[PDB]
Amino acid sequence: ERIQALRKEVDRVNREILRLLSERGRLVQEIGRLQTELGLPHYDPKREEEMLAYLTAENPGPFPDETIRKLFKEIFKASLDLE
């Protein structure tokens, strides 16, 4: 039915998010390797705040800005862990 169809759309979106998160992970891994060789820090709160700023500014909804901020902070946290 309609709920069944919507669930399939959610599966598609979930898989796309997994792919994008993984792509982001590989990018940050690359950045981390460069920072290590250049003797630079991995944690950059200025950069994190800048990303949170444009993401909240561009938030199209329905999630509240605070939720978008929360989710991306978690994504950024997972990245440092990986680096």
Add this chain to the structure above:
Amino acid sequence: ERIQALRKEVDRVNREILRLLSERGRLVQEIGRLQTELGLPHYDPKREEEMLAYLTAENPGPFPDETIRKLFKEIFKASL
């Protein structure tokens, strides 16, 4: 530099993730309106575990399965 270039790619991916998260939000809202009309529950922990299950199985890395599960649990909780 090289890091600056990679950060631009990260920006692009961040924005794609924002779009997909928002799309997921709209879908969940639509499902909810139908569930309400039909007298069905919205909160479905089993369905959430089902989604975590294939995402865990399909995880291509580099994030560990535990991290993928934690991130999606946050996405699901934010959708409640």
